[PDB]
């Protein structure tokens, strides 16, 4: 109508250890967002959306990234 | 039959800017790969497999982030 459609709307609200994430996604604003939208996949199978707005995010994140190039 | 199945075998072997860069993702070692591929989702609607094992391949991806990030 007049608004766009981010892939994620409501974010998470629970800080947890990257000890459960096997794949990370990042999704630049596009013609669908206005911002930016970090996705992931947790090992259990699911997908979850965080925000860069919450600070233990930018943590957990820069851990998981740590890791897969330590490996 | 003994060995592992990566989700990217082949890397990209040369060095762009993000300009063309709207997703990226990123995959930690799994039952199907000993290792770390970095694969991304180029404008044009394209998935490519980068390889860290390359220093532009950290730069061009770093600047994804400050770019998703300022965003």
Same mark, same amino acid.
């Given at each position: 109508?007049?608004?766009?459609?981010?892939?994620?709307?409501?974010?998470?609200?629970?800080?947890?250890?990257?000890?459960?994430?096997?794949?990370?996604?990042?999704?630049? /604003? #596009?013609?669908?967002?206005? $911002?930016?939208?970090?996705?992931?996949?947790? /090992?259990? #199978?699911?997908?979850?959306?965080?925000?860069?707005?919450? $600070?233990?995010?930018?943590?957990?994140?820069?851990?998981?990234?740590?890791?897969?190039? $330590?490996?």
């Amino acid at each position: 109508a007049k608004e766009l459609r981010c892939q994620c709307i409501k974010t998470y609200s629970k800080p947890f250890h990257p000890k459960f994430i096997k794949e990370l996604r990042v999704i630049e /604003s #596009g013609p669908h967002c206005a $911002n930016t939208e970090i996705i992931v996949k947790l /090992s259990d #199978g699911r997908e979850l959306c965080l925000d860069p707005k919450e $600070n233990w995010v930018q943590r957990v994140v820069e851990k998981f990234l740590k890791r897969a190039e $330590n490996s």
